[PDB]
Amino acid sequence: HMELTEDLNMELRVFFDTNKSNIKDQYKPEIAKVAEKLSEYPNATARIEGHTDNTGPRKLNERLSLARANSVKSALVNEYNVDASRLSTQGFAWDQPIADNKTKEGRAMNRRVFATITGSR
Amino acid sequence: SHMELTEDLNMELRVFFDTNKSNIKDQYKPEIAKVAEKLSEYPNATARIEGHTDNTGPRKLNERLSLARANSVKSALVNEYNVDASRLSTQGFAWDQPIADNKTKEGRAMNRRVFATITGSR
Numbered sequence: 001h002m003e004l005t006e007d008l009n010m011e012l013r014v015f016f017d018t019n020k021s022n023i024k025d026q027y028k029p030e031i032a033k034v035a036e037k038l039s040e041y042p043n044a045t046a047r048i049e050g051h052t053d054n055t056g057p058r059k060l061n062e063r064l065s066l067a068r069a070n071s072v073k074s075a076l077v078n079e080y081n082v083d084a085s086r087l088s089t090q091g092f093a094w095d096q097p098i099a100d101n102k103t104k105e106g107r108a109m110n111r112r113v114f115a116t117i118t119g120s121r
Numbered sequence: 122s123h124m125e126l127t128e129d130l131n132m133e134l135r136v137f138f139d140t141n142k143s144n145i146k147d148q149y150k151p152e153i154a155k156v157a158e159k160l161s162e163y164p165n166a167t168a169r170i171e172g173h174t175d176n177t178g179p180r181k182l183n184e185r186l187s188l189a190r191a192n193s194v195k196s197a198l199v200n201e202y203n204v205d206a207s208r209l210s211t212q213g214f215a216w217d218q219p220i221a222d223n224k225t226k227e228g229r230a231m232n233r234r235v236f237a238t239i240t241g242s243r
């Protein structure tokens with residue numbers, strides 16, 4: 001006898017322009033690959049978390065962070081027919097920076113969605 | 122790039138043997154083939170193959186036979202499936218690691234085994 005499992009772990013990082021929550025063209029191949037693996041691992045789920053740099057009104061950044069996570073989700077749901085209930089979204093506004101908000105470069109890093117996908121088969 | 126993707130494989134194989142024998146019996150061949158299939162789909166995976174005996178008969182016979190059983194499973198992957206030999210370790214433990222009661226025929230049959238763990242990622 002023989003038993004086997006395969007475990008999926010994926011991290012997707014999507015970055016955004018100031019004030020924007022669109023998915024730039026360059027990320028579309030990475031979203032396609034996430035969709036492919038959610039089909040290959042049908043029990044898989046994703047936790048999609050969106051973020052802003054620390055500029056502009058708090059209320060703007062609460063919305064924009066969630067809008068960025070939702071744009072990612074929407075791309076999977078609408079363009080790849082991924083079931084919505086497998087993908088959670090949350091926005092964290094500026095509360096979890098990964099880089100220096102003092103520089104243009106650190107702010108571009110903070111304007112992001114990180115999605116973690118896990119599954120097994 | 123903007124994505125990290127890992128798929129981890131964990132697979133367990135159990136093969137059991139007739140007394141004094143290290144040949145692979147036919148009923149085990151579909152499983153060994155499925156192991157070779159995954160070692161191909163995960164070309165970085167390796168296998169730890171461990172052979173064992175029941176506690177009957179001379180000590181050195183069991184030392185040799187336990188490693189012979191582990192080597193016979195390795196030999197099937199290497200020779201029939203062209204798995205790279207350096208990816209597979211073999212080790213015999215004679216009767217030192219029983220999984221069943223050596224006082225019965227059925228327990229002795231469970232101890233005459235090779236257990237292999239195959240792990241890796243792609």
Ligand SMILES: N[C@H](CCC[C@H](N)C(=O)O)C(=O)O
Nearest residue numbers: 017018019052053055056111
């Ligand atoms: N011009 C805008 C930039 C804010 C949006 C920013 N926090 C982002 O993450 O894209 C302002 O400073 O009010």
Ligand SMILES: N[C@H](CCC[C@H](N)C(=O)O)C(=O)O
Nearest residue numbers: 140141174175177178179233
């Ligand atoms: N009839 C042999 C059997 C010994 C090998 C046995 N320990 C095995 O694991 O196959 C003897 O008693 O010397």
